[PDB]
Amino acid sequence: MATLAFILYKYFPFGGLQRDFMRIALECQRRGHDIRVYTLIWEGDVPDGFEVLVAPVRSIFNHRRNEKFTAWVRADLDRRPVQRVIGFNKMPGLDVYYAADACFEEKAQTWGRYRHFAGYERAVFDPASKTEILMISEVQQPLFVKHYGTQAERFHLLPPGISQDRRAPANAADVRAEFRREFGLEEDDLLLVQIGSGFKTKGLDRSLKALSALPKALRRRTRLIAIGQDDPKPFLLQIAALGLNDQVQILKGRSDIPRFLLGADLLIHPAYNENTGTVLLEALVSGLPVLVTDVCGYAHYIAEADAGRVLPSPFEQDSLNRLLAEMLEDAPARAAWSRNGLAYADHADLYSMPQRAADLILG
Numbered sequence: 393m394a395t396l397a398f399i400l401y402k403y404f405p406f407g408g409l410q411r412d413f414m415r416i417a418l419e420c421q422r423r424g425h426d427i428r429v430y431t432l433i434w435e436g437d438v439p440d441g442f443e444v445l446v447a448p449v450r451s452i453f454n455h456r457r458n459e460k461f462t463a464w465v466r467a468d469l470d471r472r473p474v475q476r477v478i479g480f481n482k483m484p485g486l487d488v489y490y491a492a493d494a495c496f497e498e499k500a501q502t503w504g505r506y507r508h509f510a511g512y513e514r515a516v517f518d519p520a521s522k523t524e525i526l527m528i529s530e531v532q533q534p535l536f537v538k539h540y541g542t543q544a545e546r547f548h549l550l551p552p553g554i555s556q557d558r559r560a561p562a563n564a565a566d567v568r569a570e571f572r573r574e575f576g577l578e579e580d581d582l583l584l585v586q587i588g589s590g591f592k593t594k595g596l597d598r599s600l601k602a603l604s605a606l607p608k609a610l611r612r613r614t615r616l617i618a619i620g621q622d623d624p625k626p627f628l629l630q631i632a633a634l635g636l637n638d639q640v641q642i643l644k645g646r647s648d649i650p651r652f653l654l655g656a657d658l659l660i661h662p663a664y665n666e667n668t669g670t671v672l673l674e675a676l677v678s679g680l681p682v683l684v685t686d687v688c689g690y691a692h693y694i695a696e697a698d699a700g701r702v703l704p705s706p707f708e709q710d711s712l713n714r715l716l717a718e719m720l721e722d723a724p725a726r727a728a729w730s731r732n733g734l735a736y737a738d739h740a741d742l743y744s745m746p747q748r749a750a751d752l753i754l755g
């Protein structure tokens with residue numbers, strides 16, 4: 393058979409892991425392979441030719457639900473074999489694992505849950521495992537080796553896989569204008585965007601503080617839009633307390649991210665932690681200056697392209713506050729950062745991930 397089985401716990405269109413999966417699966421499909429997907433949930437369109445299997449397993453604890461998932465999948469595969477098994481979450485029985493997550497053991501070293509997630513990571517990374525690993529954050533490889541001793545030859549570093557529709561188009565100025573008209577933004581207004589479905593760990597709380605803390609002249613001109621498949625309710629108290637009710641909107645998952653990237657004035661991403669941060673590069677290729685914490689795996693790109701500022705660790709609210717103020721005050725610097733991002737996008741390989749992953753998956 394030429395069937396490839398792709399395994400991920402959750403498909404939905406507004407996540408990095410999920411979009412990377414989709415691009416790899418579509419590339420492998422174009423190369424003559426039918427696609428089977430095993431998942432706990434599939435939200436949104438199913439592409440032609442994808443055989444999507446949603447597990448009927450249930451458990452009160454997610455970690456136990458995941459083990460039941462593995463048994464369910466392995467029983468299906470035993471009955472209906474495939475050419476290769478590619479997982480986007482850590483579990484036993486993968487031929488290939490795409491490391492969309494950072495090293496768990498490292499995070500834990502900051503009971504049933506811990507043992508499950510450590511055991512599933514070990515199932516991939518143990519030296520007796522045969523799983524081949526597609527890395528997307530370079531910084532994580534030494535940590536997997538530290539914790540499991542994984543052989544060097546099993547790791548394959550991929551370049552970024554930013555989709556084409558995020559690159560600034562020929563009519564960028566028209567898209568910007570139409571966006572700003574729609575949202576009621578005038579030339580003297582400043583729009584911050586915080587993009588990604590995980591507002592807490594991506595530091596929406598720090599973004600709101602920095603917005604609140606701006607000097608009066610900037611604070612009056614500036615608004616924030618957060619975009620993600622995430623609950624806004626927990627931030628509403630903070631927004632009211634900071635007096636920002638009229639300056640902040642939180643939207644659900646959107647498929648028109650490129651319009652926000654062209655229409656905004658800064659991307660703010662002061663994440664607590666972030667394996668890579670695709671949105672960081674999407675801002676860069678859009679010419680949108682970025683303010684990001686150094687812990688993000690893709691932060692180095694912002695620094696090296698000089699397409700915004702990276703805030704060094706340890707995190708201090710006061711430094712974020714000050715950096716945001718300094719970036720919004722300096723319109724020449726923002727114009728340079730924008731130019732720098734666009735020029736870097738024309739030279740650097742930020743696009744080829746799905747082809748490279750497919751080459752490794754299929755030999």
Ligand SMILES: O=c1ccn([C@@H]2O[C@H](COP(=O)(O)OP(=O)(O)O[C@H]3O[C@H](CO)[C@H](O)[C@H](O)[C@H]3O)[C@@H](O)[C@H]2O)c(=O)[nH]1
Binds near residue numbers: 670674
């Ligand atoms: O409303 C939304 C919100 C997000 N996105 C898209 O979803 C992706 C988000 O990817 P990020 O890496 O920025 O963030 P995630 O947290 O969703 O992604 C996860 O997987 C990534 C790639 O596999 C990285 O490893 C990352 O650190 C990890 O948290 C981007 O293409 C972004 O444009 C949308 O299309 N619509």
